[PDB]
Amino acid sequence: MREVISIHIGQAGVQIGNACWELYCLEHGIQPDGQMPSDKSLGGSDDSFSTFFSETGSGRHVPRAVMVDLEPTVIDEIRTGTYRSLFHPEQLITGKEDAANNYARGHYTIGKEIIDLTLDRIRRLADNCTGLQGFLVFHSFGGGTGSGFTSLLMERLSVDYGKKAKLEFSIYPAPQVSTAVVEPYNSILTTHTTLEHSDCSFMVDNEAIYDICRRNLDIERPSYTNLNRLIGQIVSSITASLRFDGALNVDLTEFQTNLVPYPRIHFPLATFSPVISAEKAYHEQLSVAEITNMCFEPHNQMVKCDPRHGKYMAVCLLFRGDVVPKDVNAAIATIKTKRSIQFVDWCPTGFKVGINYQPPTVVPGGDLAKVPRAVCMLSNTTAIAEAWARLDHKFDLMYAKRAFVHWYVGEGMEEGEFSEAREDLAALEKDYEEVGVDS
Amino acid sequence: MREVISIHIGQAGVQIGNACWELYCLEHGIQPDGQMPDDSFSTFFSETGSGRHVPRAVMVDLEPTVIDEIRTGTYRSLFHPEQLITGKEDAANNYARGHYTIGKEIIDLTLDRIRRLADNCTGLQGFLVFHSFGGGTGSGFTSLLMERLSVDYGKKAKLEFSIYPAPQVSTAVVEPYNSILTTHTTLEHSDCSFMVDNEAIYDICRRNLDIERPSYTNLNRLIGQIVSSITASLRFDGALNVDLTEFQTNLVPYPRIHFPLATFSPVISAEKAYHEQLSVAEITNMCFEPHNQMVKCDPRHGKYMAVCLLFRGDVVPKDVNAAIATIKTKRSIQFVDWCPTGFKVGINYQPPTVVPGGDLAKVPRAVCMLSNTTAIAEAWARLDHKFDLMYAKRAFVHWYVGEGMEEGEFSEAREDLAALEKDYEEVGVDS
Amino acid sequence: MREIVHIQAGQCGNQIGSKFWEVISDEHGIDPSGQYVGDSDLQLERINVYYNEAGSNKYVPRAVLVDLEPGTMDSVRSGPFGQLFRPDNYVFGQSGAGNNWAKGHYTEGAELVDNVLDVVRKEAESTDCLQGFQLTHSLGGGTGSGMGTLLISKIREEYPDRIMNTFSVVPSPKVSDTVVEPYNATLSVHQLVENTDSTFCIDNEALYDICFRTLKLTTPTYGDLNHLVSATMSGVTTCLRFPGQLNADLRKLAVNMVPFPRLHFFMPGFAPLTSRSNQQYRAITVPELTQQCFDAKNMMAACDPRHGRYLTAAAIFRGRMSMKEVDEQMLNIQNKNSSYFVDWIPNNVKTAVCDIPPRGLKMSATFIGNSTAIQELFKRISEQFTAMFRRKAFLHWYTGEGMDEMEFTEAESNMNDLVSEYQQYQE
Amino acid sequence: MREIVHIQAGQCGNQIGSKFWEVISDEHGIDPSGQYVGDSDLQLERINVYYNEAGSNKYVPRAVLVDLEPGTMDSVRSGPFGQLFRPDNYVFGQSGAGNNWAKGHYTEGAELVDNVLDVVRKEAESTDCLQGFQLTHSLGGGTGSGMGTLLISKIREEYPDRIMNTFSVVPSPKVSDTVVEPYNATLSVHQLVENTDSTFCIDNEALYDICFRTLKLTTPTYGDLNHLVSATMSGVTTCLRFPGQLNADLRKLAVNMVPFPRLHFFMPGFAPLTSRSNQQYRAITVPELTQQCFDAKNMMAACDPRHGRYLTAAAIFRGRMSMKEVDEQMLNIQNKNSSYFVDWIPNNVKTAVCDIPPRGLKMSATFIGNSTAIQELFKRISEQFTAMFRRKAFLHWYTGEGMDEMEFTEAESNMNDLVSEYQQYQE
Amino acid sequence: TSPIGRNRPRHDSVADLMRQDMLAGVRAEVDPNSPTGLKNARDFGHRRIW
Amino acid sequence: MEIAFDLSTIFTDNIQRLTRTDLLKYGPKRYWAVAQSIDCLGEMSSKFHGWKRVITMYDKIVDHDEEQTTYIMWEKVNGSKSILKGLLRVGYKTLYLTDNEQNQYMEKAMCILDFFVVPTEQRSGNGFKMFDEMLKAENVTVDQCAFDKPSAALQQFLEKYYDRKDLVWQSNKYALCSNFFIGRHPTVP
Ligand SMILES: Nc1nc2c(ncn2[C@@H]2O[C@H](COP(=O)(O)CP(=O)(O)OP(=O)(O)O)[C@@H](O)[C@H]2O)c(=O)[nH]1
Ligand SMILES: Nc1nc2c(ncn2[C@@H]2O[C@H](COP(=O)(O)OP(=O)(O)OP(=O)(O)O)[C@@H](O)[C@H]2O)c(=O)[nH]1
Ligand SMILES: O=S(=O)(O)CCN1CCN(CCS(=O)(=O)O)CC1
């Protein structure tokens, strides 16, 4: 009765969607080939699979996904992979040439080739579900495709649908670990669109999750698979309230109302605190108090920024598994009484609590140990303005010399867009500064 | 109890019959040797008493190479050896050779075999003549055979399945002449002529089925599926059975308006059927798409007059009624004002049987939309233009007049087809 | 005493008759093998109304199954109650009428009508005192719409005084499944108006609407519709088989409803129809049953009863109930809807209360309504017939069997008079 | 003869209502399937107050189950005693209000309130003589608070003479579970003041404190708090359903406890609450019963009565007891605590006694108090609302559905006026 | 391979909906460890205290 | 429960095996009794378990992509009348099993698609007889069988009649026993 549409754009978006849909298939008991072996689950309260997977008369379940990319390499890898029979062949949209880490190529030149087909497939998926709750968008924040095509598709979707929610899970550029020399250009060009058309953009840094894997999992040299698994766990915990029964269910509209105070102040953080190896979990007690405390420490945030310099504004704690509200209330009291955790003076209550009775599922071979309790702490903290400041500094350093502007202007994108995006990001930082200061 | 005689003329008709009989044997569980490892097969087969089943078919064709392939093929044990009529010299894509010269050599034997088949019957329903308009024998010999059948069995129905020349794709130089000459005999004796086009099925296989290079082995299978869907009401029970008589009554408004189209809805690939919800409404809606008809014409340029929907498999009548209401709400699908209820429905319980190695996918339900529309006049206009261009200079009429055949019947058939297309245009006019 | 002969014509008629005989066998405790397995003496004292005793505790129904195609009759023989009917009562032709009225009425039908009349006469002469004939058919088809009318004419000629009851399924445009059904409908109603004494109009559209709105059935099959019609048929003649505080047989209904010879077309219904979800949470009482009987959504004809004034109505209640409650409810219904009833008839409704409800049911009521709103079906059929006959759309098929274009003109004009008479008393 | 219509709005309202109906069915001996399995004639007598008749001794509640999220209906149906409710009384929208007062009060609540009022009116017209309406909801949420206040306004417009009791669950900062609760609470306080006869403020902090210090419950959940509120709700109206020495209906309590029209915010409580370990160490006679009743730690409003004198008090006793002991205990608790009662009212405590105690308890008492300690309960909400509205946080969500800052200022002014009204009689 | 006969079109659901005495009543119990069971045990149940 | 037919004239024994081929042979056109029994027993099981839609139907079995076997227990009463005392549907499926220590498996094992006994005969100790007959007919041990979302009552049934406890649950709502010696692990951690 409640359905959401998952859109994965670019290589990072598609690769994260791989882990996301693996997690969904394991969580809802759906085999990778499409079949659902449990006949008894087609009834009663076990109809939760309709949220993500569309049902067909043949017994197969087709995910409501649109894996679009300008290059065919990753989608062809999927089509030759284990999940080849899972996704609908028409949903796996491919181009012929990537955006080459160029915003203009992904926005106009190569975008216009398949933007119509992508919109047609999205409309076809939407017309199949009668309870469309919103959109989930996964894209690299500083890539070429994941910037330009994401901007184009997001603005087209905002035009077409409007009131439907749109939640973005972007890969924000790390302060130091950047894989391309032109990341800040694409990042700040897509900052303008992701602010105007999205609703809740949860950015993620690769370096922060690398540090989290090194510390809490003792993974010395991790890869993209672990990061994708963690992001998939976060998204599954976010959407758990839409498909499982529990006290204080949190809908997407409830999330937006509780966490987003202003139309432009809508860029939260995200963290999955109960991340721990299979060995340390035995020693840990793994109760509500400690997993709630672990959320607020700077070493558990999945964005490379220190929350201590930024007052918290609105926190949405999405608990899972065996959670009793008394424990959550005690944890909230202990968090509020802490002097280090600084809240704003205009938000006397800033905790929105969502509890679910479905414990998190663990993918076999995964680094995350089996836990009875889980929580995602999505905070609209101001400290990430430091990350935006670093991005603006990088943009200024490259744009003072016109480092690679010719690449962008050679694909039909004006030079004034750079200044427009820079001033838009400056306005966003100014808005954060105005909001953060106490009355 | 109710059995139908099937006749296959020419190479096209014989190969289509091969596909149809393979499909029938698979549907009824009859092995190629004829042995069956209830009453379903009584329609298309005759009991030998010894447990074998001989199909009720006649394979007649002037050239013997294709019939020789049959006799050396897998299905050499099905048909009666005396039912595979053969000649010595083919019609050579000439109407005169197949109609008079070589026709009279074996027309008597073909009529005797047809009479033998009809005598070994109790509940004859009609005839199933498979042939091609553009071919020599499949036109002249078909004309002569149907002329004699309309005399010997003047009451019984004559359902004809004819291969039609394509608007652009051609395999012969004198096929317009043969098609024009056959259009005379189609009106006089036949009762329903479900013409299909090679180009349309090529487009269907390229677009829906996604096969790039089909060579007659998918076209024949699709035509076999169409004829099986047509005749499924006579051998499998279900709600709203449609016999041949009520089929003609609902589909043929006037004696000359008896040229319906043909369409099979759920023609999709194996890997695409797994991820599609093939609902009754969806298949009914995709029946009426212009790029799904098996005749290279645009139904949106004409007015529908009578539409028969022969649903198969697991189908609920309420779903059919809802789908038909949805179709009637649309303004693009125009129906003539004098036929307010131009829908005839048949819901057979037997799902289609997919052949191993076939292009079609296993589906729980299917429908064969058989529409009689005025849009078919475009193809007749195209053949009129081709015949006029080829006859102004008299390109190859000498080959015809030199085979005991008159020149004036060319103009006679031309004006007959002109009268037919004028009649279609007049009928299409709203009251 | 007061035996009834039942005839099933066509595929739809055969299906409805088979379901009706299953329902009656359930009511009387008749096993599908034909044996009696009932537990009440009142179920056997009047078994002769619908069944003939075969001696060895077997009660073969007094039914005649006629159909031009043998497929339906083979299905009935292989069905759940294939052993119930008398094997020689099955009469069939070689091929069906092909949705052709002329084929099923003039040559192919008339070939078999001799045998059908022979078996009908044989069944009728075995009765102590015959009451009337029940015939189930569909106006849209060829075999039904033709053979049923010809049989009605022949029986009316043979038995001019016995009551005649036809449960006809009138075609509806929204559930139109035949290209030439209005032709057959007009050519059937032509004979129906003159010959029969009580025609119950049934529409597949109304039955589907009932199964959707009321019973909340997602997938209504033909079994459900046939069962609804069977329940109505059982309710109509329940006073001939069980004792009741107030009794009303077929002749009493015929006298009470029709004021004029040609106004014998009725809209039936059923009161206790409730969905599974609301089954436990609804208290079945006489006021609720009467309200559901007179509810427009509960009618089994597509025409809305609110569009025309009621001439006469008849609610045949079944079950133990106080007559004061029934009378007060019916009077309240008449008073509240005083605009829906003709002012020149003081008491506009007939009441009958029976003591034996349907099995597993505590209280039931069958509604039979005679309203001028029934003219809507005939007007729609007339519009379709005029549209097709303006150009002789499919007339050549009928003229090939010996018909005439003048006969089609007469049928349309005669049915227009039927519409005129119904409209005449509606103001 | 004194039927009561029950309305459940929001998740908290629906869960508390489910617990309440479970407790009532326990008291009346009603099977979860709707059947009657009681052993005392008193339970079945005067059962029409909370139940209707469905035939075959099956009773269904007069409850109207209301929420904008179908998930709440699914949970209620799947939960215990979910089969008891009538399916037609389930009215729901597409999605919840999302903690938005405007969403649940102006567009979605406005669209669903028509159906809710239709169901409520249909249920009310069936009653012989309804005493009034009782509604359960939560002020912190969007759906419950907003559209329940809309329902309160609409019903008060339709039925100006009937008693309207709302058991609202007010939010508290200690046990805050949302972010925008102060906005919804402030917007709902005005409607509650305007269109309620008597409202019983309930707080989650007080219920958790009771479960932790009065009882010794390990890991209390929402079920235990809902059960406490259910016990209070059942004990409030125990005189309407059972005989007693000194009966008192809802109107009598409203007359006793409302000196002035706006001063009707009560403070509920339950007397026999004691730990499992102390079951055998403490008696349950009248003196200790009243001592608990008036104990400041046995209130469900999360306010200390020691900070404000009661305007009025009321202890509705149950079970066999002597009126002399009750009267002397009330006199003792009113004289020994003279500093906690208003001087300008001679007698502050209203006593009601019933002859039927709740099952499993020898005697029970329900205490409700119109104390001025609600000043703090509304002062917390006023402080939070002022802090949030100083910087206009989260305001765009409310302004995006049709609200205005002027309405927020109006609500804040109204609630400040109410708290000043409580203050100025504190003296 | 053989012709397939169907029983779903032969179903008669109305014949059961016309009953008024046959009541199932008894229903299965959801898994206590399942989220629905946990909700029924926590928010729809209580520890008996009197 | 009761069916107005003499089931002894078709079924050769009290608990009759019914394969997909057997059900195809016993078509509803001429052998309506068996199809009606299957459909009514499936409807009763769905109503008892509270499932939204009926999972056990004759048509769903005959047209299933994989072979399935259903078990029916009846009892002749009098003439053309019989009663039905249970239903059990079993079949082979490919399961993505995951044992302890996060070992991934992909093995073919027996599945318990549907298991239902009428309430009046539930206390007669006959479900054990039905399960023993199924095991004998399909020569599969309890070790190598899988249970599709087993109910609690099924859990006590197993742990009481076969001493099989601690059903390890898989991700696909299947609770296979603690016997993972079917084959080698496709993947190891
Ligand atoms: N209420 C029902 N209507 C039915 C049923 N079966 C068919 N019909 C409707 O009857 C109409 C046509 O009736 P038949 O199918 O019985 C045709 P008939 O036997 O009268 O003539 P032939 O065409 O010569 O067989 C058409 O609208 C069908 O949808 C049934 O079981 N119940
Ligand atoms: N966590 C994670 N980050 C990724 C992944 N793939 C790429 N990234 C990061 O995303 C940024 C670039 O993403 P691309 O995948 O290169 O972006 P694109 O726009 O899809 O690229 P083109 O298709 O070549 O136009 C870099 O910071 C990468 O480290 C992935 O699978 N997981
Ligand atoms: O065997 S006995 O008759 O003694 C007990 C009844 N038996 C219990 C085990 N299963 C129920 C599983 S479920 O239907 O609850 O899932 C079949 C019925």
PDB file of N, CA, C and O in Angstrom, chain A residues 56 60 62 85 87-90 128, chain B residues 210 271-278:
ATOM      1  N   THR A  56       4.500  -9.681  -9.642  1.00  0.00           N
ATOM      2  CA  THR A  56       3.993 -10.096 -10.940  1.00  0.00           C
ATOM      3  C   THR A  56       3.196 -11.385 -10.786  1.00  0.00           C
ATOM      4  O   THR A  56       3.349 -12.123  -9.809  1.00  0.00           O
ATOM      5  N   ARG A  60       7.234 -13.917  -9.687  1.00  0.00           N
ATOM      6  CA  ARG A  60       8.465 -13.151  -9.591  1.00  0.00           C
ATOM      7  C   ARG A  60       8.185 -11.772  -9.014  1.00  0.00           C
ATOM      8  O   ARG A  60       7.085 -11.232  -9.148  1.00  0.00           O
ATOM      9  N   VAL A  62       9.667  -7.878  -9.043  1.00  0.00           N
ATOM     10  CA  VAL A  62      10.502  -6.967  -9.820  1.00  0.00           C
ATOM     11  C   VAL A  62      10.767  -5.729  -8.970  1.00  0.00           C
ATOM     12  O   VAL A  62       9.811  -5.031  -8.605  1.00  0.00           O
ATOM     13  N   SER A  85      18.594 -11.492 -13.453  1.00  0.00           N
ATOM     14  CA  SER A  85      17.175 -11.773 -13.609  1.00  0.00           C
ATOM     15  C   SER A  85      16.306 -11.013 -12.619  1.00  0.00           C
ATOM     16  O   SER A  85      15.076 -11.094 -12.707  1.00  0.00           O
ATOM     17  N   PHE A  87      16.305  -7.384 -11.776  1.00  0.00           N
ATOM     18  CA  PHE A  87      15.788  -6.128 -12.296  1.00  0.00           C
ATOM     19  C   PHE A  87      15.088  -6.341 -13.632  1.00  0.00           C
ATOM     20  O   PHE A  87      15.395  -7.270 -14.381  1.00  0.00           O
ATOM     21  N   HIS A  88      14.133  -5.468 -13.920  1.00  0.00           N
ATOM     22  CA  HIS A  88      13.482  -5.480 -15.223  1.00  0.00           C
ATOM     23  C   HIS A  88      14.477  -5.035 -16.286  1.00  0.00           C
ATOM     24  O   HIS A  88      15.173  -4.032 -16.092  1.00  0.00           O
ATOM     25  N   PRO A  89      14.585  -5.750 -17.409  1.00  0.00           N
ATOM     26  CA  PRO A  89      15.573  -5.361 -18.428  1.00  0.00           C
ATOM     27  C   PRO A  89      15.379  -3.954 -18.955  1.00  0.00           C
ATOM     28  O   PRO A  89      16.365  -3.290 -19.297  1.00  0.00           O
ATOM     29  N   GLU A  90      14.136  -3.474 -19.037  1.00  0.00           N
ATOM     30  CA  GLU A  90      13.898  -2.122 -19.527  1.00  0.00           C
ATOM     31  C   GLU A  90      14.300  -1.058 -18.515  1.00  0.00           C
ATOM     32  O   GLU A  90      14.565   0.081 -18.911  1.00  0.00           O
ATOM     33  N   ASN A 128       2.408   2.134 -11.914  1.00  0.00           N
ATOM     34  CA  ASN A 128       2.109   0.792 -11.433  1.00  0.00           C
ATOM     35  C   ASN A 128       1.793   0.773  -9.943  1.00  0.00           C
ATOM     36  O   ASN A 128       0.955  -0.021  -9.503  1.00  0.00           O
TER      37      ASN A 128
ATOM     38  N   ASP B 210      12.017  -9.646 -30.584  1.00  0.00           N
ATOM     39  CA  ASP B 210      13.397  -9.165 -30.611  1.00  0.00           C
ATOM     40  C   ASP B 210      14.328 -10.035 -31.452  1.00  0.00           C
ATOM     41  O   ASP B 210      15.520  -9.719 -31.529  1.00  0.00           O
ATOM     42  N   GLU B 271      12.637 -13.853 -21.719  1.00  0.00           N
ATOM     43  CA  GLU B 271      13.210 -13.104 -20.608  1.00  0.00           C
ATOM     44  C   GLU B 271      12.407 -11.862 -20.252  1.00  0.00           C
ATOM     45  O   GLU B 271      12.604 -11.305 -19.167  1.00  0.00           O
ATOM     46  N   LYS B 272      11.513 -11.413 -21.131  1.00  0.00           N
ATOM     47  CA  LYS B 272      10.672 -10.263 -20.837  1.00  0.00           C
ATOM     48  C   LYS B 272       9.327 -10.650 -20.241  1.00  0.00           C
ATOM     49  O   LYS B 272       8.704  -9.824 -19.565  1.00  0.00           O
ATOM     50  N   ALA B 273       8.867 -11.880 -20.475  1.00  0.00           N
ATOM     51  CA  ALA B 273       7.595 -12.311 -19.907  1.00  0.00           C
ATOM     52  C   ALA B 273       7.693 -12.521 -18.403  1.00  0.00           C
ATOM     53  O   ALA B 273       6.683 -12.420 -17.697  1.00  0.00           O
ATOM     54  N   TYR B 274       8.891 -12.814 -17.897  1.00  0.00           N
ATOM     55  CA  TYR B 274       9.050 -13.086 -16.474  1.00  0.00           C
ATOM     56  C   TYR B 274       8.835 -11.838 -15.630  1.00  0.00           C
ATOM     57  O   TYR B 274       8.428 -11.942 -14.468  1.00  0.00           O
ATOM     58  N   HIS B 275       9.096 -10.657 -16.189  1.00  0.00           N
ATOM     59  CA  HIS B 275       9.029  -9.407 -15.445  1.00  0.00           C
ATOM     60  C   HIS B 275       7.860  -8.530 -15.878  1.00  0.00           C
ATOM     61  O   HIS B 275       7.880  -7.319 -15.640  1.00  0.00           O
ATOM     62  N   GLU B 276       6.842  -9.112 -16.504  1.00  0.00           N
ATOM     63  CA  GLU B 276       5.690  -8.358 -16.974  1.00  0.00           C
ATOM     64  C   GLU B 276       4.416  -8.953 -16.400  1.00  0.00           C
ATOM     65  O   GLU B 276       4.252 -10.176 -16.362  1.00  0.00           O
ATOM     66  N   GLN B 277       3.514  -8.082 -15.956  1.00  0.00           N
ATOM     67  CA  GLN B 277       2.194  -8.496 -15.482  1.00  0.00           C
ATOM     68  C   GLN B 277       1.251  -8.509 -16.680  1.00  0.00           C
ATOM     69  O   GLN B 277       0.671  -7.486 -17.049  1.00  0.00           O
ATOM     70  N   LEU B 278       1.098  -9.681 -17.297  1.00  0.00           N
ATOM     71  CA  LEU B 278       0.287  -9.817 -18.505  1.00  0.00           C
ATOM     72  C   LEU B 278      -1.184  -9.953 -18.115  1.00  0.00           C
ATOM     73  O   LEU B 278      -1.795 -11.023 -18.186  1.00  0.00           O
TER      74      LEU B 278
END
